[PDB]
Design a binder for this molecule. Structure first.
Ligand SMILES: *C/C=C(C)/C=C/C=C(C)/C=C/C1=C(C)CCCC1(C)C
Length: 133
């Protein structure tokens, strides 16, 4: 399914530290981020996504339309300008963030009752799994 709608509660979060370090997120921020439970709320209407990440610390939204390139300034993350593009490869939603970091972006897909999110930057891969609330 391409339907990724839902309130998704983080079940596991593998190598978030390595991914954040590849992005040059500061030590103290990584230390806090790595311990927090994330909730990811996805509102998906056709090609339009409104994505909201929440934790007890930082909360972060990003909206995009599938197949429409968009500039991002990754404020409150690594503070870089990237050109972002989110497209479908089969039932995998693929984001590429073109810019300074190589292999930067993510892949997101549904398997059964779970949402999988693989974040990449440089040689690092972070694997997150969420379950619907
Ligand atoms: C569809 C899935 C999306 C848009 C995933 C977005 C992921 C984030 C906004 C992640 C944010 C963070 C980090 C990369 C590290 C610092 C802590 C967070 C949660 C602000």
């Amino acid at each position: 399914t391409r339907d990724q709608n839902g309130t998704w509660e983080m079940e596991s979060n593998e190598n978030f530290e390595g991914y954040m370090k590849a992005l040059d997120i500061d030590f103290a921020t990584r230390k806090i981020a790595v311990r927090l439970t994330q909730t990811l709320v996805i509102d998906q209407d056709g090609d339009n996504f409104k994505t909201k990440c929440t934790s007890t610390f930082r909360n972060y939204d990003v909206d995009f339309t599938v197949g429409v390139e968009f500039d991002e300034y990754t404020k409150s993350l690594d503070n870089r300008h990237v050109k972002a593009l989110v497209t479908w490869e089969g039932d995998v939603l693929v984001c590429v963030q073109k810019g300074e970091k190589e292999n930067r972006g993510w892949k997101k897909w549904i398997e059964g009752d779970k949402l999988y999110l693989e974040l990449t930057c440089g040689d690092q891969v972070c694997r997150q799994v969420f379950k619907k609330k």
